[model samples]
Target: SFVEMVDNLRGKSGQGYYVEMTVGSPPQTLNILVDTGSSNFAVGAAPHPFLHRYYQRQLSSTYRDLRKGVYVPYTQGKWEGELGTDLVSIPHGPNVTVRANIAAITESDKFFINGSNWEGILGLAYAEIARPDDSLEPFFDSLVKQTHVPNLFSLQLCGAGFVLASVGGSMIIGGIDHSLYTGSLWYTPIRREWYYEVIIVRVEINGQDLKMDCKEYNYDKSIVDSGTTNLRLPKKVFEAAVKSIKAASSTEKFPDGFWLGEQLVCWQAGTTPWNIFPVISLYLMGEVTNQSFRITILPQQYLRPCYKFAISQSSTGTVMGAVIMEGFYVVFDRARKRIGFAVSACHVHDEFRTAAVEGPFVTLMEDCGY
Candidate 1:
C-alpha cells in the first residue's frame, strides 16, 4: 500500500528527496528520497563503521543509537542495516525527536548503489518490521497519517535537463492535479497494505473517444506506487496496447522495441491520439484520467512473455516500471482510491548539480543501478 502525503522530503538522488527532522527538536536538516518500492526510513550514518566516509556532511545527532538495530538482507544482493528509533525532524512541520529506525548502506548492492550518494531511501510501501512495541506503524505512514493534510501524495519525476541529487522534484501531498483525469476511478482491495490501493478503471489511449476494452483495463489489485515509474501490465494488455498502437500508426514490428533511423509512429485507439511509437498518452485504468502515461511500446524482443508478464491469484497484472512513467505527474490518491496521471516533461530533480528542483522521473540508471 502506498500512502499519499505531501512532499516532506528534500535533496534528490532519485527523482524526489526526503527532509530530515528531529523527534523532540524543532526542526533539523536532513534530506531523504521517498521510495515506494522499499518500506523503511533511512539516512546516511555519520560514523558508520565500514562505510561512512563516502557520504557528505549531514547534521550530527546523538539522540538514537545505530548499534542496537537489526541487519537486513537483500534478496537482490544488497546489504543493509536497520537501526532503532531515533529523533527525526522535517522542516515546515512539527519537530519529532522521537525514536525512529534509520538505515545506512555499507557495501554496494549493485555496482552503482551507494548510501552516501543517496542519504538513504525512505521506504513507504507495505511490509512489516519487528518492533519493541507491537502496535507501531511504518515510519512514513505514521508521519503522513499524523501530518499529511488531505492525505494525498504526488510525485513529479523530472527529466534530462535535471542533474542528480536535486530537490525541485516534489513528493507532493494532499492535493492532486485534476486536469489529467477522465473517468471514474477503479479500486482494488488491499492484499498487503502499507498504503491502501485502487484498481485502475481502464486506460484511455491518447484520450480516445472510443470505448476501451473494459476487461483488459481493470486490474483486480494494484498498489498505486510512487517509487516505481513504469506501468507493469498483464501480457495481454501490454500486447494489445502495442498492437492497437501499431494498427493506428501504420507501422509494424522492428524487433527490440526501438529502431534506428526511423520515423516515429502515431496512434489513436479512440478519441485520444497518441504516437505510441514515439510520444503518446495512455489513461491509467480509465478511472483517474492521467493514469495514462507515455510509453516506449518496445519491440518485445528480450521480454520472455511468460516470465515478464506473469499473473497470480492476487493480481490481474504486472508491475509498472519507471520507463513508462516518463513525462507524467503520477498521483497516488489514498483518500479517493485512485491514481492520477498527467503529462509533464519534468525529468528527475538534480539536487547535486542544483538543476531544476521539484517533480517527476528524477532517477538515473546510475542512481538505481538498473
Candidate 2:
C-alpha cells in the first residue's frame, strides 16, 4: 500500500529548513533544501569538497549520465552541472521510490562560498516552472504519478531560536497532518500553474488602506513561496508602508528602528510598544466559490526583529515568504490547482511572545468547519 512521507525539517539558523533523502540503488544519504520558489532538483553544490555530502554518481550503479549540462541562476547564487536520472528514495517514508531525473552540479559561484550543510535542493514548485528544461518533471510530481499517493504537500516551518541545529518542523508529502494547524484550511484558487500565484484583492496596514491601487500600479498578484525568507513587496508599497509606520509612531525619523546593511527593517526586540506597529492584512479572492479570504499578521509577528522582512524589486507584484508564513500552516493542493492556509498552533517561547491577547487569526470560510 502507498503512504505519505514526513521529513523532519531542521532549521539553518537565520536561513530556512532542510531535509534528508537517499539517492541511487545503494541509497546514499544527502541533505536537501526544500524550496518552492524554483523547480530544479540538483545536488553537489558544496564549494569545498569537504563542506557538503556530494552526490557520487560513479558509486551508484543505478545512475545514468545524460551528458547534458545545466545552469541555474538564483538570488542566492548560480549552480551548474550535468543532468541525469537515478533511483531516489525518501528514507523516512514507506517503501516508496521513483526514477527521478536530477542535476548533479559540479561548480558553484560566490553564492555558496560560505557553503551549506545540505548537499542539494529538492525543488517542490510545480513542474511547469522547472528548469534546466521544463520537459523534466518534478520529483514529487513523478512520485505521485508512479505511486498511489495524492498530489499534495504541506509545510510547517517554525520561528528562529537559540538552537541552530534542532528540528524546527516538518514537510508532509502526498497528504497533510491536521494536528499541525488550529483551524480548517482555507483554499485560494491558483492564478497560474507555474508558480503558487494567487489573486490578492486588498492589502491593509492597521485597518487603514495603504492605497496600492493594484490596477493602476500593477501589484495585484502574490506568490506564496517557502523558499523566500522575506515579504517581498513592490517598491512603492514597501516604501509607503515603512514611511507610514514611522509616521504613526510619532518618530520624525527612524531612531528606535534601523535599516540593516542588507536592507532589512529592525528594532530592539522588547523595547518597542506593540501598538506602535500596525497589523498587516491581505485579502485574497477564492476560486470556484468566488469568496474572499483574509490573512492578517499581528504586530508581534510583523514587528519581530529575529526574522528579516524586506522588499524585493525583482517582481512588480508581491511574494509572501516565511516571515509572515511561520504563523500559519500552508498547503499546496496540486490536484485542485489551489493553495491553502490555516493559523498554525504556535507557541509562546522564551524570546518570542504574542503582544496581542485576542488569539490568532483564522480563515473566514463558514463552511470550512473550523
Candidate 3:
C-alpha cells in the first residue's frame, strides 16, 4: 500500500490551501496549491523569486522539455507555459513516484502566490479536464495506473482556530483514514468528469424547504469543489435561501462586505449562526444508482464571527465549496465515479495539537542534484 499523507499548508493568499511535493529525479521539493477545481499540474505559474523552487529544465537528468506551448485560464489569471515530463515523487513515507508531463509556466498574470506561499498548483480533477488538452492524463490517474496506490483519494481541509499554526489539513492518497470521519460514508454519483458534480434533489434552510428555480434556468447540477472557499448558488436560489435563513434566525443582518454580489454576515462573539440559524441540507440523487444522499452544513461550519456564512450569487450552477465541506469528510472515488461524505469529527484543533507533537510532516531535502 503506497499511502502518502500530504499536509495542507495555510496559503499566503486567502482561501488558498497547499501541499508539498518533489519533482524531478533526486527530487526538488516544491509547495503547490491543492486545486480540485482544475486539472493541470503546473509549476512556476506564479512569480516567486524568494522561493527558488522553479523548474529549470537544464538542471534535471530526467527532464524532457516538449516545448509545446500550453495555456490554462482561471478566474484570477492565466498560466502560459511549455509542456514536459519528469519524475515527480512524494517526499515522506512510501516514496511513491510518477513520471508524467507537466506544465512549466513561463509567464503568469495575477497568480495565487504573494511571495511566500505555494509555487504552483496540483490539480486533482479528472483527466477529462487536464490542460494542453483534455487527453492528458492527470498526475493522480497516472499514479494509480502505474504505481501501487489505490484509485481513491481523500481530503480533510483544516478549519480555522489553530492553537499555534498547526498543519491545516491532509490529503491521503491511495486510501482513506477511517479514524478521521464518523459513521458510514454517503456516496453520491459523479455527473461529469470536469468537476465533482451531482444532481441536486432539494435544498432546505432552517428546516424550511427552499425551492430551487432550476427549471426556469434549465441547469440543475451542483459542483462539490475543495478548491473553492465559499458556497455559490444561482441568483434566485441565493435570495430564497437568504430570506429563509433571515426569517428563521431573526438576527440582525450585516450591512456590507458582499463577495460576488452576496453578503457575508457576522454576529456577536460566540453567537454562531449554526446555533441560531437553521441547518442547511442539500439532498442529492445518484445519477447511476438513483440512490439519495444528504449533505448537511452546520452554522458553525459556514458562519463565523469575522466572516459570516458566505453564499455568493453565480450565473453558473450551485457550488458546494470548502465552507460547507468543513463539516464533513469528503471522498472522491474515481474508480466508482462517485463522491462520498461522512460527518467530520471537526477535530482540527486536536489534529493540529497532535501534529505539533509529531513534528513536521515533510522532511527537508538538502540537495536533489540541482
Q: Write the per-residue lDDT of candidate 3 for residues 32-108, one digit (tens) a residue.
A: 87788778888883345544667777767899877688976778787698888899876643456789778988887
Off by over 4 Å in 2: 1-7, 45-50, 74-77, 113-116, 161-167, 216-221, 251-272, 288-290, 303-316, 347-370
* Model 1: per-residue Cα lDDT over 176-226, one tens digit each: 544333232232223345443433333434334224444444444345444
Candidate 1 is scored at a TM of 0.55
Off by over 4 Å in 3: 1-13, 45-52, 74-76, 92-94, 162-167, 213-220, 256-274, 287-290, 347-370
Report how far off residue 267 is in candidate 2 (Å).
7.4
In the range 234-342, model 2's lDDT, one tens digit per residue, is 6776777766665676643443334321533444645545566566777666654435666777554453343333433435467787766766778889898888877
lDDT of each: 0.41, 0.67, 0.66
* Winning candidate number (lDDT): 2
For model 2, what is the error of residue 204's alpha carbon versus the real structure, in angstroms, after optimal superposition? Answer: 0.8
